[PDB]
Amino acid sequence: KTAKVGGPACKIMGRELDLDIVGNAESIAAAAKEMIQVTEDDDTNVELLGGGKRALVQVPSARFDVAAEYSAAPLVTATAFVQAIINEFDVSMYDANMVKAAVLGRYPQS
Amino acid sequence: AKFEDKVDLYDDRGNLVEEQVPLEALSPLRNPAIKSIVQGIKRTVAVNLEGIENALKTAKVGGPACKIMGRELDLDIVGNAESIAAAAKEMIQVTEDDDTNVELLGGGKRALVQVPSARFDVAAEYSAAPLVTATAFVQAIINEFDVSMYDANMVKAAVLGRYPQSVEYMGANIATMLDIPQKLEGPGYALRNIMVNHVVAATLKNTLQAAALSTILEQTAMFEMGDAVGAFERMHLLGLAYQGMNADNLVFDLVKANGKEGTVGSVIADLVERALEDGVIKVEKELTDYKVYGTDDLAMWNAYAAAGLMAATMVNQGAARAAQGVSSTLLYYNDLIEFETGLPSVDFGKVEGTAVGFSFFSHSIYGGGGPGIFNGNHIVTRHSKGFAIPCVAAAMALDAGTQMFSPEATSGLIKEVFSQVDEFREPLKYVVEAAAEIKNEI
Amino acid sequence: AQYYPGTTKVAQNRRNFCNPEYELEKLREISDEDVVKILGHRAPGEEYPSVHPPLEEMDEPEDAIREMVEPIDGAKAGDRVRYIQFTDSMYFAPAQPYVRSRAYLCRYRGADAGTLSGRQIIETRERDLEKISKELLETEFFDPARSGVRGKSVHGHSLRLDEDGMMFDMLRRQIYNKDTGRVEMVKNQIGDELDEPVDLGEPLDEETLMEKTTIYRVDGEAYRDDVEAVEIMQRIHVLRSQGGFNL
Amino acid sequence: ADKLFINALKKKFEESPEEKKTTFYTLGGWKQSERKTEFVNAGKEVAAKRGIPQYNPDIGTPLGQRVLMPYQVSTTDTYVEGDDLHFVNNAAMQQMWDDIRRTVIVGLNHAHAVIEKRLGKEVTPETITHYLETVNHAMPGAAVVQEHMVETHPALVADSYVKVFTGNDEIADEIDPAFVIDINKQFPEDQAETLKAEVGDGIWQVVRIPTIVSRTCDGATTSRWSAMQIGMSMISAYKQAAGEAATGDFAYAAKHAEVIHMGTYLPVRRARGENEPGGVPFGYLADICQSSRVNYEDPVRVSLDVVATGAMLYDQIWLGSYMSGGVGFTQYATAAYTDNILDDFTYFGKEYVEDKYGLCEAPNNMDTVLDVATEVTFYGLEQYEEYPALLEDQFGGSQRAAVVAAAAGCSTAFATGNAQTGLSGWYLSMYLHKEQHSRLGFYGYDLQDQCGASNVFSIRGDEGLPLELRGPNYPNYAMNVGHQGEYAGISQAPHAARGDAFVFNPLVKIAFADDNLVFDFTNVRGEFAKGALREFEPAGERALITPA
Amino acid sequence: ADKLFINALKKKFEESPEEKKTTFYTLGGWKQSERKTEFVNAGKEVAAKRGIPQYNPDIGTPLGQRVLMPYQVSTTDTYVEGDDLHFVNNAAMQQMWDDIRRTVIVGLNHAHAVIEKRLGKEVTPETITHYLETVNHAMPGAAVVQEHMVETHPALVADSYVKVFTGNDEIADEIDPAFVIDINKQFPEDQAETLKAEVGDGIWQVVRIPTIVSRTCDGATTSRWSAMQIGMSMISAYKQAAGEAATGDFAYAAKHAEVIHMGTYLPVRRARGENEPGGVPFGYLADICQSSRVNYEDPVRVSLDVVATGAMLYDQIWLGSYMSGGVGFTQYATAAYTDNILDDFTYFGKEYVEDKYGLCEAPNNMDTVLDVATEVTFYGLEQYEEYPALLEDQFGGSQRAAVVAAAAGCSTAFATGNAQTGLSGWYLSMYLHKEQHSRLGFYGYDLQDQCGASNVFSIRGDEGLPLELRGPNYPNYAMNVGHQGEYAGISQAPHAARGDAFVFNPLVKIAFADDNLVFDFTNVRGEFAKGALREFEPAGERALITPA
Numbered sequence A: 001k002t003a004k005v006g007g008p009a010c011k012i013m014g015r016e017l018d019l020d021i022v023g024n025a026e027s028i029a030a031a032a033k034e035m036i037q038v039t040e041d042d043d044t045n046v047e048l049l050g051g052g053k054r055a056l057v058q059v060p061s062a063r064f065d066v067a068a069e070y071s072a073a074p075l076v077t078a079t080a081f082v083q084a085i086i087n088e089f090d091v092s093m094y095d096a097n098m099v100k101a102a103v104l105g106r107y108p109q110s
Numbered sequence B: 001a002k003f004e005d006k007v008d009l010y011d012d013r014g015n016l017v018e019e020q021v022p023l024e025a026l027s028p029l030r031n032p033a034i035k036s037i038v039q040g041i042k043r044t045v046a047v048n049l050e051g052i053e054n055a056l057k058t059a060k061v062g063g064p065a066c067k068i069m070g071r072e073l074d075l076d077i078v079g080n081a082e083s084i085a086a087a088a089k090e091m092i093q094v095t096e097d098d099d100t101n102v103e104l105l106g107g108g109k110r111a112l113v114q115v116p117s118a119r120f121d122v123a124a125e126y127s128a129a130p131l132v133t134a135t136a137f138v139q140a141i142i143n144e145f146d147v148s149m150y151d152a153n154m155v156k157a158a159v160l161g162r163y164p165q166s167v168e169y170m171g172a173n174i175a176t177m178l179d180i181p182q183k184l185e186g187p188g189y190a191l192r193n194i195m196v197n198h199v200v201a202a203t204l205k206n207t208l209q210a211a212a213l214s215t216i217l218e219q220t221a222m223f224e225m226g227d228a229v230g231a232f233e234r235m236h237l238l239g240l241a242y243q244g245m246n247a248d249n250l251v252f253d254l255v256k257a258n259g260k261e262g263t264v265g266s267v268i269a270d271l272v273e274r275a276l277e278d279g280v281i282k283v284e285k286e287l288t289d290y291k292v293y294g295t296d297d298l299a300m301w302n303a304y305a306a307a308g309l310m311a312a313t314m315v316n317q318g319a320a321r322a323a324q325g326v327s328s329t330l331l332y333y334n335d336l337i338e339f340e341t342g343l344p345s346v347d348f349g350k351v352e353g354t355a356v357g358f359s360f361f362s363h364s365i366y367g368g369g370g371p372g373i374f375n376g377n378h379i380v381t382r383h384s385k386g387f388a389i390p391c392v393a394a395a396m397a398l399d400a401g402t403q404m405f406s407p408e409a410t411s412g413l414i415k416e417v418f419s420q421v422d423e424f425r426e427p428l429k430y431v432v433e434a435a436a437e438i439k440n441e442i
Numbered sequence C: 001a002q003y004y005p006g007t008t009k010v011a012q013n014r015r016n017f018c019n020p021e022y023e024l025e026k027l028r029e030i031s032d033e034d035v036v037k038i039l040g041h042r043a044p045g046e047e048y049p050s051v052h053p054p055l056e057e058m059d060e061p062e063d064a065i066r067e068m069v070e071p072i073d074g075a076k077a078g079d080r081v082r083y084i085q086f087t088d089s090m091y092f093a094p095a096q097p098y099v100r101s102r103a104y105l106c107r108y109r110g111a112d113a114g115t116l117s118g119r120q121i122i123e124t125r126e127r128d129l130e131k132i133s134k135e136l137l138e139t140e141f142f143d144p145a146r147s148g149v150r151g152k153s154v155h156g157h158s159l160r161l162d163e164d165g166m167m168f169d170m171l172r173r174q175i176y177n178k179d180t181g182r183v184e185m186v187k188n189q190i191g192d193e194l195d196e197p198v199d200l201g202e203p204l205d206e207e208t209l210m211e212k213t214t215i216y217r218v219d220g221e222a223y224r225d226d227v228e229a230v231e232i233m234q235r236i237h238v239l240r241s242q243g244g245f246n247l
Numbered sequence D, E: 001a002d003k004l005f006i007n008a009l010k011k012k013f014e015e016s017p018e019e020k021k022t023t024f025y026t027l028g029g030w031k032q033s034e035r036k037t038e039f040v041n042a043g044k045e046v047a048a049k050r051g052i053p054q055y056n057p058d059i060g061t062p063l064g065q066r067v068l069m070p071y072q073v074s075t076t077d078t079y080v081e082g083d084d085l086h087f088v089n090n091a092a093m094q095q096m097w098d099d100i101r102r103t104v105i106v107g108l109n110h111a112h113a114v115i116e117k118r119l120g121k122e123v124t125p126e127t128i129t130h131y132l133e134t135v136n137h138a139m140p141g142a143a144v145v146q147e148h149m150v151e152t153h154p155a156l157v158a159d160s161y162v163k164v165f166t167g168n169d170e171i172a173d174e175i176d177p178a179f180v181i182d183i184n185k186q187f188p189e190d191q192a193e194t195l196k197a198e199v200g201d202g203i204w205q206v207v208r209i210p211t212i213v214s215r216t217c218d219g220a221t222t223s224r225w226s227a228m229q230i231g232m233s234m235i236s237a238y239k240q241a242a243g244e245a246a247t248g249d250f251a252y253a254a255k256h257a258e259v260i261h262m263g264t265y266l267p268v269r270r271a272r273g274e275n276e277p278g279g280v281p282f283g284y285l286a287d288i289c290q291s292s293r294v295n296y297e298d299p300v301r302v303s304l305d306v307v308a309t310g311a312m313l314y315d316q317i318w319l320g321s322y323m324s325g326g327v328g329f330t331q332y333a334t335a336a337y338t339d340n341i342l343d344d345f346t347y348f349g350k351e352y353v354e355d356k357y358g359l360c361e362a363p364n365n366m367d368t369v370l371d372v373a374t375e376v377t378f379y380g381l382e383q384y385e386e387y388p389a390l391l392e393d394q395f396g397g398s399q400r401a402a403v404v405a406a407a408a409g410c411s412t413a414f415a416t417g418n419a420q421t422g423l424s425g426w427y428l429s430m431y432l433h434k435e436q437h438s439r440l441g442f443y444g445y446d447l448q449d450q451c452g453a454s455n456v457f458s459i460r461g462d463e464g465l466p467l468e469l470r471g472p473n474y475p476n477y478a479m480n481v482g483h484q485g486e487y488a489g490i491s492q493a494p495h496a497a498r499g500d501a502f503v504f505n506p507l508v509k510i511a512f513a514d515d516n517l518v519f520d521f522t523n524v525r526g527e528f529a530k531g532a533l534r535e536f537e538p539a540g541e542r543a544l545i546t547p548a
């Protein structure tokens, strides 16, 4: 909503997006969980906290069994929430990159 | 039951092995043979006992041209390899009947070591393999010869090099296919930082197996990176199936039709015809004497194109028996197919982009090198998300000796040790069998 | 295959250069020895140096890809990989940098082609390079004024012509003779003197350069006026753009 | 009436610019050049002095078979040979990078909370002033607490200091004005209001460590050196024990919790610490350049001064030396800031968009991209076709591609008011160009451009990022000339058309709006010209401590 | 007769060095010092010039309540105020670091095999000479292939060049001697024999890139820069296509397969690339120092020249600026290279060892550590007790700890011929010292010294390493002053007592045996004195391209 993304004091004027993410948290969390999970009823956990303001996410163990390390957790979680937010509000191709910056920051430049 | 697609799976002689296999039975997330290859690569180490012994005797430890005069230790390590390796295994294993494997090779000059899976189960990443192996051998050597407290640090330097002063194990006499976690270009990249030469070494220059091993590792990394999550998942699975597993015998049949006299451009024509024949693409509009093709299934077009791309590499670099033009093939296969069809090239331009930079950084002063030193973590070749590097592996498999920095030069220890592992050497077999086996669980 | 969209002569020419069934017009006759002299990799009658043993003398791995893919002859012999490189004037040279790489990988087996703005290169096994190079030099791939055979110091693609209509060459490898109206190659492609110059024939006249050129230019046929070709380019842009976002 | 580059073409060549034929080979080789003659003589002297051969014009091939051209620094009337724009021979360019490398921005917000909440002492404008007098003694390398301290020569470190800013005018007015970057003075009213609203009551230090230290050491020295002297001055000015537990809070605040580096550190293959060029994101580079605050009625000029800042830093210094070296990449970069060529193309494009849409009034979509980037690409490529002299001037395809696409991408961003569609126009321009001339750039030039279209709007882990957050470590961009400086330009473009005070960080913008900088960031091209003429005086020299 | 430090103490103070009382507070504060007076005057000018307060003697506490001492540079008759030994004020020190940072070692062995085996061309002494004339034009930044290249000013880059060395005398004889580091000329016979045997028929380049570039950029630029101009010179001299597939082999060889960096890259918390101080292992630092080839009959002098080399670089520039900054750490380092104090303690130790065991004839064990380290530690500490001037000279406990332990560590290694027992001696010295005076160093001084005994002989992953292989990024050693340079000296000590030509890398040893370097590595402390007197002329200045 503020276009403040990418690090401390960073902001991109004119890129603001007014999305009710917390108000639609349950739909967004359910859609993100469907992408994070490998199979229905595996050990994926997505749980909303603080009235939808926070989410606890546990990425299924099957993803780590065929991973070298542990960065699938943030990476799978980030992309699933980016896509879920995009899908929830039908965010255009032109603007979706702001959702990506709001979730995972300045990465891959940083 | 997420995707309706099914593929026919073939062996590396073009024989149908299993028809009608659900696409997701080839998924890194589901397929037990991919899981075993990945867990294998995490846990396998080569030990150069001869190199350790020679570094000790000459006091040449800690990297290129380094020596400490007066530190020389003359230890009959290779002559006592069996006792040293058994003593190391005792340390490495968690229990007596676990999957620890320690095997002498080359009459004791080398050892294949597979650290127990139980260590990885409570580890964040994969560095327990080298670090557990290295300390087990250092301690086994010291105990074997009763090396003094005063001298034992030389054994450590011979085994693991200049580490912890260097970030890397610099001058070490052990090797892994993986490199340290600090060298990742990005999080989730570790399975991409395996040199093409190491893949070609481990598959003993069998082209289709080298392509398979490279694609499995590349596309498995796409899952770890998050690239194969949600919208992109089917595209990545189709890419692994058609480009790396010879699904539907498409790669194999394109090579057969074009191996005698064929060129990149002839492979392209056959691929487009085949995509037309199969209903993957259809004419969308006629311009002047020019058909604009479209598709209702971009991920399937992409997969067909990626199959042709691999076949074009095998035709082009196969005909030269010289790997260097794989950078050219990776570019113009994709450039040509776009103007042939009106459809986006493999990975939506990203293979072409990678190929531009890879061509440059294998024919210029600025960096890079021959095709065999690249890998999916290399800054030059990380851009395509699994669709480029498997072609580079096929090309180096087909090279008959034009490279100075060949797998013989860069990867000799990996060749001796890692080729011993059947699932690394012949991964296409194992992955096909496992997909067959789990076919009805999808 | 259709190769390239567009309704201009430029676009047709681009299609023809790619189409291995189109017979390239031959414009000049060059001896075997002169091709070798121009390349400058070996002297005429010197044995082809080897980089590895003949394939027949080696134990290749069992590999259906190797079985199905016939090696070019120089690969069978173990020849070096050597090159020939050309610079094409933007003043209507017949062939141009992407057109060459595209055409080379349609026409030629076992080819490593590279495209740059001031230089375009093909590397392949030496005896096979020699055969390809005869075609590249004898046919309408090459004009001796608007094209130059150059393994270094390639500058001149974007330069103005001299008074003879020749392309700039820092090392003056190709000399227009005013007495015959013909160009001679006086040096090999790397810039060393040949004992005996090679005749490369007359430059193509202006009308013929226009008919044969594959560059688009406002004083030729402009790319913006090939609206179907601008298509497919804008199409590809859009579909790539959409693709990288979703499918 | 004339295209902007015509005068420069007339200066370089005898022919009129439309003439297709010229004369070569009779120019005397290197002897046509005043600068190459200087070099030949210097080479003779150097080799004789040191006993090892060095520069020698007869090694390899003989330069100057064609005209060795003067170049006009764009927006100036200064014409210099290209050697004078090499960063090695240009003190202005070296100082520009030194002023960026030796700068860090450091909050005082946490620090003052530590003083108040943990030490239980008061912070007022007057204690801040005392602290700032103290830190202006200490920062260059001088002592405030221990006996028998040995110190830096104040004249060698004269360029090191600390200033502050804050968006609260009334507080800014109570801190001694010698130490304050006055936002209302440096910025036009609307930009000042924006910047002050962004900063609010926050109080930020701009710290510049000595050029001589930056040059001896590295960019990652800067936030450390800063934090040492902040820490000393906090002890001295607020009467701490000189080394108590609370001291560590100031350290962690100055080094981590409220530090803003100019550049983030880089991965191992191109391993570098903080405050190296590769870590500076394009949005920051646009904000470091101060053209926005002085040339705010001319969005082209602001965008192209940003291009000049980044082409020089990212191509000549960063890619042409840190990442390669040797002769390097002067003219890869000079193409984007000489002869008024990019200017001609971008003013064309700004005019086109203004007449058709109104700046910032075009739909933000692919229709606008296709429209604007195609129009402007055709315009720029037509110029090379209509003027052979222009084509011979920008003789390398990569140069043309970067110039033409910069104009197309900036113009598309002028239309939409969004950097991301600007970036899509940049890629489209390359694909059209490549098809038009059947050539584009050097062998590896369009690695990023063939990936480009697909990665503009991607949201994937190492693919998706607003252009303002990308920089030289965005994976596709990590290697190649002819892009990074132009991308800084395209990041500036829409914000310059919008009248925005900053592109990506308001603190970075304010931090370079400081008359005590050595390099003049409001007139980057002017400064490059001054350095080419050998009229720029850098900090960091050792004359005072060496023989006369 | 006199201890070696008596002349220095007598010059510092009016009292005999034995006296226990003196006069303070009435010496005039900063006014007793020429150098501080210079600084007060400079600070007023600087502040007025720039409009910002700067150096001010009335900020914080008043320096010079006690004597502000001169220091003798050990082995010289040069006495200077300590400010003149600050690296910011000493161009000799800055040039030492530049000469290392800008140097890389690059084989021609793979390159020559690419030529003969992939290209099928010959390599001979003649083609090598032509190549070296070519790379000596190209390396400083001048062109060999392309038309219209713009180049570095030869005078600005006069210190860049390429030399070779090889163990094969006949081949070395055939290369123009201007390009050759002559091992037989630069080393005494027995050392020449060893080094030649180590190199064998290998041919190695020593590449120095320009100081000006190294200061503009960083150490990780050096091997890139080097590789580009090698790559160009290989193209030009060997008639390759200018950019074929084989060109990539030369790149990979020069940048990776046969490159020897001076320093390896550092992990993220201290993120730096190659050729930064923290990556230089102790054994390379000893080998860079050239005291071994000129002072070979005196193992103490050799070892303490190394200490001086390392103390300045690792404590003053590295830990005192790259890893911290400000006034920094001059006197932590000067304690190890001034006043002949370390010299007296280490000559004592050498004499003890010589008399009792014979150099290198002690058992390599803990018995020897306990004997020698204990004896020398007590000697050193008794000097501070017997000479109140000495104690007030080296006023900081850290300083004394480093100096006494360095003597103890070197003397232990002189007895054993082994660096690792040397190191154990160093740690034991610390523990004895700590108990004798109920103090040791600064707050965090003995992090490594409390880990130290246990980590000397450990074999564990990040613990175990021969001392020659350790350096500033050895985990325990990564942070703190008053150890790195002395460890470099203990690495040198056993090799010096043994008569060894090198400590850790014979290529590194030979590579600095070059009279074309700017800094004289054979007489490091002489050079520090020259730089303190403002008599040293560094490379890299920009006076040619700035105003008069």
Ligand code: F43
Pocket (backbone or CB within 6 Å): B363, B364, B365, B366, C116, C117, C118, C119, C151, C152, C153, C154, C155, C156, C157, C158, D325, D326, D327, D328, D329, D330, D331, D332, D333, D395, D396, D397, D398, D399, D440, D441, D442, D443, E138, E142, E143, E144, E145, E146, E147, E149, E150, E228, E229, E232, E235, E242, E243
């Ligand atoms: C040897 C290479 C291959 C390689 O890896 N780098 C080279 C050479 C390198 C050298 C040339 C210096 C010298 O002459 O000694 C430097 C200056 C880099 C360095 N080592 O300092 C360079 N190229 Ni190159 N290089 C450039 C360019 C180009 C253009 C030149 C085309 C034209 O027709 O002249 C082409 C690529 C293209 O065709 O697109 C080119 C190629 C080449 N580039 C060909 C040699 C071409 C030929 O033989 O003459 N550069 C340019 O397009 C403009 C800027 C220019 C760079 C110097 C600067 O920016 O001022 C230089 C950048």
Ligand SMILES: C[C@@H](OP(=O)(O)O)[C@H](NC(=O)CCCCCCS)C(=O)O
Pocket (backbone or CB within 6 Å): B361, B366, B367, B368, B369, B379, B380, D269, D270, D319, D320, D323, D324, D444, D478, D479, D480, D481, E224, E252, E255
């Ligand atoms: C490829 C890579 O080098 P290596 O492949 O690691 O030897 C990389 N070079 C560069 O990107 C050089 C950048 C500028 C030179 C080309 C400019 S277009 C680097 O050194 O880190």
Ligand SMILES: O=S(=O)(O)CCS
Pocket (backbone or CB within 6 Å): B360, B363, B364, B365, C116, D442, D443, D444, E243
């Ligand atoms: O010729 S290359 O494209 O490799 C380099 C351009 S500087």
Ligand SMILES: O=S(=O)(O)CCS
Pocket (backbone or CB within 6 Å): D243, E442, E443, E444
């Ligand atoms: O007092 S501390 O030991 O913290 C620092 C000494 S420089």
Ligand SMILES: [Cl-]
Pocket (backbone or CB within 6 Å): B231, B234, B235, B299, C247
């Ligand atoms: Cl899909």
Ligand SMILES: [Mg+2]
Pocket (backbone or CB within 6 Å): B079
């Ligand atoms: Mg035996």
Ligand SMILES: [Mg+2]
Pocket (backbone or CB within 6 Å): B146, B147, B148, B149
């Ligand atoms: Mg024992």
Ligand SMILES: [Mg+2]
Pocket (backbone or CB within 6 Å): B266, B269, B270
């Ligand atoms: Mg066919």
Ligand SMILES: [Mg+2]
Pocket (backbone or CB within 6 Å): C029, C030, C031, C032
């Ligand atoms: Mg004939």
Ligand SMILES: [Mg+2]
Pocket (backbone or CB within 6 Å): D174
């Ligand atoms: Mg007041």
Ligand SMILES: [Mg+2]
Pocket (backbone or CB within 6 Å): E014, E015, E016
């Ligand atoms: Mg007296």
Ligand SMILES: [Mg+2]
Pocket (backbone or CB within 6 Å): E018, E386
């Ligand atoms: Mg007494």
Ligand SMILES: [Mg+2]
Pocket (backbone or CB within 6 Å): E015, E019, E021, E022
């Ligand atoms: Mg008295």
Ligand SMILES: [Mg+2]
Pocket (backbone or CB within 6 Å): E116, E122, E123, E124
């Ligand atoms: Mg030879």
Ligand SMILES: [Mg+2]
Pocket (backbone or CB within 6 Å): E176, E178
């Ligand atoms: Mg001579």
Ligand code: NA
Pocket (backbone or CB within 6 Å): A041, A042, A043, A044, A045
């Ligand atoms: Na679950």
